[PDB]
Write an enzyme that holds these catalytic residues in place. Sequence first.
Site, PDB file in Angstrom:
ATOM      1  N   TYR B 145       7.111   4.063 -63.230  1.00  0.00           N
ATOM      2  CA  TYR B 145       7.231   5.425 -62.730  1.00  0.00           C
ATOM      3  C   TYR B 145       8.437   5.485 -61.800  1.00  0.00           C
ATOM      4  O   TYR B 145       8.555   4.682 -60.878  1.00  0.00           O
ATOM      5  CB  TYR B 145       5.972   5.830 -61.967  1.00  0.00           C
ATOM      6  CG  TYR B 145       6.043   7.237 -61.434  1.00  0.00           C
ATOM      7  CD1 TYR B 145       6.184   8.319 -62.302  1.00  0.00           C
ATOM      8  CD2 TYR B 145       6.003   7.488 -60.061  1.00  0.00           C
ATOM      9  CE1 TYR B 145       6.288   9.614 -61.824  1.00  0.00           C
ATOM     10  CE2 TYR B 145       6.106   8.789 -59.567  1.00  0.00           C
ATOM     11  CZ  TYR B 145       6.250   9.845 -60.456  1.00  0.00           C
ATOM     12  OH  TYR B 145       6.370  11.130 -59.982  1.00  0.00           O
ATOM     13  N   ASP B 234      13.998  -0.589 -58.870  1.00  0.00           N
ATOM     14  CA  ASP B 234      13.310   0.492 -58.186  1.00  0.00           C
ATOM     15  C   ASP B 234      12.325  -0.154 -57.225  1.00  0.00           C
ATOM     16  O   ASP B 234      11.224  -0.558 -57.617  1.00  0.00           O
ATOM     17  CB  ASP B 234      12.558   1.387 -59.176  1.00  0.00           C
ATOM     18  CG  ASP B 234      11.868   2.568 -58.495  1.00  0.00           C
ATOM     19  OD1 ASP B 234      11.697   2.539 -57.250  1.00  0.00           O
ATOM     20  OD2 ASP B 234      11.487   3.518 -59.209  1.00  0.00           O
ATOM     21  N   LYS B 262       9.544   5.400 -49.487  1.00  0.00           N
ATOM     22  CA  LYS B 262       8.266   5.355 -48.755  1.00  0.00           C
ATOM     23  C   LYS B 262       8.332   4.556 -47.433  1.00  0.00           C
ATOM     24  O   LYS B 262       8.625   5.088 -46.370  1.00  0.00           O
ATOM     25  CB  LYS B 262       7.210   4.746 -49.679  1.00  0.00           C
ATOM     26  CG  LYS B 262       7.266   5.333 -51.091  1.00  0.00           C
ATOM     27  CD  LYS B 262       6.023   4.986 -51.911  1.00  0.00           C
ATOM     28  CE  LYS B 262       5.735   6.020 -53.005  1.00  0.00           C
ATOM     29  NZ  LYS B 262       5.130   5.358 -54.160  1.00  0.00           N
TER      30      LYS B 262
HETATM   31  C1  LIG Z   1       8.504   3.193 -58.006  1.00  0.00           C
HETATM   32  C2  LIG Z   1       8.509   4.654 -57.606  1.00  0.00           C
HETATM   33  N1  LIG Z   1       9.626   5.405 -57.790  1.00  0.00           N
HETATM   34  C3  LIG Z   1       9.689   6.716 -57.451  1.00  0.00           C
HETATM   35  C4  LIG Z   1       8.565   7.348 -56.883  1.00  0.00           C
HETATM   36  C5  LIG Z   1       8.548   8.797 -56.477  1.00  0.00           C
HETATM   37  O1  LIG Z   1       8.762   8.850 -55.059  1.00  0.00           O
HETATM   38  P1  LIG Z   1       8.714  10.387 -54.588  1.00  0.00           P
HETATM   39  O2  LIG Z   1       7.350  10.890 -54.890  1.00  0.00           O
HETATM   40  O3  LIG Z   1       8.959  10.453 -53.008  1.00  0.00           O
HETATM   41  O4  LIG Z   1       9.781  11.295 -55.369  1.00  0.00           O
HETATM   42  C6  LIG Z   1       7.375   6.594 -56.674  1.00  0.00           C
HETATM   43  C7  LIG Z   1       6.139   7.249 -56.058  1.00  0.00           C
HETATM   44  N2  LIG Z   1       4.972   7.067 -56.929  1.00  0.00           N
HETATM   45  C8  LIG Z   1       7.346   5.232 -57.039  1.00  0.00           C
HETATM   46  O5  LIG Z   1       6.216   4.501 -56.843  1.00  0.00           O
END
Ligand SMILES: Cc1ncc(COP(=O)(O)O)c(CN)c1O
Lengths: 425, 425
Positions: B145, B234, B262
């Site tokens: 994701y 990522d 995060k």
């Molecule tokens: C690996 C990864 N990349 C991107 C995101 C999306 O981050 P955001 O919701 O702040 O756009 C997440 C959140 N689930 C994630 O875990």
Amino acid sequence: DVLASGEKSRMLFERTKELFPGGVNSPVRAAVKPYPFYVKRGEGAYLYTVDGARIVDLVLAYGPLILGHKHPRVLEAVEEALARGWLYGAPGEAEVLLAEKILGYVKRGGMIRFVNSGTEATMTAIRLARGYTGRDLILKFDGCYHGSHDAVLVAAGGVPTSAGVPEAVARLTLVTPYNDVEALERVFAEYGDRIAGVIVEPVIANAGVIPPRREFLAALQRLSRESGALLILDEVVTGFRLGLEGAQGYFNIEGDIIVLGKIIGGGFPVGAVAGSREVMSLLTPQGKVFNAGTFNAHPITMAAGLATLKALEEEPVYSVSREAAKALEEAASEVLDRTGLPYTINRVESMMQLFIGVEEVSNAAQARKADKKFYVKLHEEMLRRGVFIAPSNLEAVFTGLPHQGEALEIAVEGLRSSLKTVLGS
Amino acid sequence: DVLASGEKSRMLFERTKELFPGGVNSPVRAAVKPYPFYVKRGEGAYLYTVDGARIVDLVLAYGPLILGHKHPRVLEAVEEALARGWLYGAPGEAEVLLAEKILGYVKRGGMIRFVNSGTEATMTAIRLARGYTGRDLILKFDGCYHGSHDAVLVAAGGVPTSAGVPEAVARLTLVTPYNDVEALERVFAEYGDRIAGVIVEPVIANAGVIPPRREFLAALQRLSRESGALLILDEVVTGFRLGLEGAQGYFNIEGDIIVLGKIIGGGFPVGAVAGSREVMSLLTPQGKVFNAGTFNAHPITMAAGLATLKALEEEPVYSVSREAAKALEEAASEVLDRTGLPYTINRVESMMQLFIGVEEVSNAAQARKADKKFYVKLHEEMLRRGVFIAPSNLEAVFTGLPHQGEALEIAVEGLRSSLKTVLGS
Ligand SMILES: Cc1ncc(COP(=O)(O)O)c(CN)c1O
Ligand SMILES: Cc1ncc(COP(=O)(O)O)c(CN)c1O
Ligand SMILES: [Cl-]
Ligand SMILES: [Cl-]
């Protein structure tokens, strides 16, 4: 008589050249002359540099700070919300109150989705228009700014205006001149039912300030309605600045999808998409148009936004801000009118911009004809007078509640004096 | 013995159905059983519902809260930063200190760009890989994701997994199974120098938790290096959770572009892209790859992030969090091992997930074979025990500093008891 960028700023400036591309985290910040000043803190109408210089803020972060910096009411609301924790991972209460208040002003009976930036917001609105209609094409206007995402980083050949954007993506976005009824009607007669949506700023704010022609507005609503394309009013800037009802109430118009941002966040990261139940219901987890976000409806953003809107309803923000911008325009006009120099000033409530060398600016093409050198010198002189206006002629000057009394006096004196200096340069 | 969703939550639940699509501002929040509980506040290891029930938080907003809710150190830093104003429109000091600290751990001598979400971050990383190489294709893995943007809302037929995403955009993204060396080598032998970049989660967190095979990691670095494609790690979740050096230091690997988020925001909206000077220098205002943002490097996010990283270096966060997750795994294992039920638990430091009905989960396909009904009942039983784990088996369980003493005891007892109940259901 004021040195915005002192030795503390100089140190940070050379130091960040190795940390960030271009030395900053957003393009427009690098254009400040002679070089960017670093801010230690902000309060009311002022920004305070790391060296100490106090500067009247006529940028206000480019829109969000209509209540000025560190507004006491918003501060207290945020302090209280902070004591309750700032991130939950599940629904909170403030988001509910903010949604109800916002929807009551921009889309009664509709729904809303909170995101984290104007970019995420317009990006979500576009994906929603495409999902709702089943079409690919998006129409935008030359000079309008909608954020940092592929679909809107396009210009008419649709070609990419940035690198890293596939030609295939760029081709799905159409572009015509702002306020050009003729061209608008033509593009619809050329693409018809292939257009998913039309995104536009009710008042341009990223090519200087440019008000809309009444015919342009009428054509937008009629053409999208007759073709089935969704009219996306990008009110990231106009929302809650042009009155509580924003552009829709101000110009008496209606959009299918309303994009919101900056002010609704009270100064914290925010973005939002509002529309009727029929359209909004397509977003996940209800429908198939995907949208998720760890920080969506962030508790502090919600709390700051709610307090901000509360202040907009209870304090004379709109009148004070309108008066400030009006006083700045009058001061600039009083000096320029005593010359044989052509110029024009566009102003809509609390947002305005000066254009040197041209008598009219009704679109981005004309705005680009304005004397950039004059403006840049004006920007620098103002800073030397302790006043901060956008370092680019294509940005806008924003006024807010704190722009009154002494702060306004300083800004007005600074503008008069800066103009004279540049005029005699 | 605990009712997470009481009458106050019930009222809000029916009330938000008319305000937000699906009743929430992010998909995963709607799956909470029997229906979403509303949070009044959060502190330490707990969330407190509007009705009053206290719940041990094993979700932690899905990653950001490794320090728990309202961490005293971060709170004080934020309070102090708040008194200095929260939005400037120009460079601040905290962003400089945070950039230096982050880069010192993930990309020494490189550069960074702060954005407002993980979505904006991966979106920026992708545009950067395309601009740097001049290629269009992006390779991602099934189950990974990367956010809420077009380029990553794709699956192998590349087709859109969401509505509103043009087929033309979806075709530019390739997808192969996670941890599949064979398939990875094949896709590169099939597309070669047309691939701009390869984006991947060093440890999957959005298809349950899935550690990487050492061969997969090695192949990723080798293939991107030999083809010229940029390896985009990522680490929005893994960054600063798998040690201060994140995935790179944990698995001893190197990425060209590191996506962060995060934790680096301390609980506030954030996202970041880090890379070598050669790649990063392409971003505006230095190069042609566009990226701008009103809230980029938001002062409060910067301050909270800096304080958070400071706490990660000075407090036993990693050991405490590792021990908590380990204790939860042992408790679940002690109960499940006394049955003839097949299952497996994947855990990497403070992130883990239970998979019922299967002995191994090394990819998303296998993760999807896990017993969803069992998990959902487990999620509900846990809530009734005052413990909050993701309502979806494809999400992850996160532990943090506050998960010790009484809070851990409650979580452990809740897990043992919830398993027994579901097992005897
Ligand atoms: C690996 C990864 N990349 C991107 C995101 C999306 O981050 P955001 O919701 O702040 O756009 C997440 C959140 N689930 C994630 O875990
Ligand atoms: C009309 C409009 N739309 C979108 C944006 C982008 O908002 P953000 O920077 O938070 O992504 C801006 C900010 N200049 C804007 O003025
Ligand atoms: Cl402020
Ligand atoms: Cl919190």
